[PDB]
């Protein structure tokens with residue numbers, strides 16, 4: 001019926017159907033459009049206290065909670081989706097990953113290289129598409145597939 005990971009859902013606040021992807025955590029009102037050996041993605045990472053390494057170039061000791069990190073991710077998504085900000089601008093300013101310095105770009109990668117929730121989300125994204133919050137042992141990610 002729908003592209004990999006995508007399902008129909010029901011809006012509580014509007015009663016209108018929407019689309020949810022249980023691999024990427026994306027959600028949108030519009031029906032999704034229409035697998036490669038490699039994808040290329042950028043990401044914005046927000047780390048927290050349970051991160052595999054609770055440290056980043058932004059913060060020597062990262063002390064926020066999983067919940068606080070998810071709310072930040074939720075605010076970044078709202079700003080990207082509203083057009084108030086662009087993904088790679090926010091990655092450069094606020095990503096807790098060292099790829100912040102390359103506007104969140106991680107380069108191309110195959111299956112078997114990244115942490116799997118990330119790998120799965122990345123490969124279920126089409127070029128140009130963004131994920132919702134993706135949880136890994138590094139923290140919470142927003143993922144943009146670029147190639």
Ligand SMILES: CC(=O)c1cc[nH]n1
Pocket residue numbers: 080085086087088128129130144
């Ligand atoms: C802001 C940006 O480049 C984006 C986010 C989803 N797709 N493109």
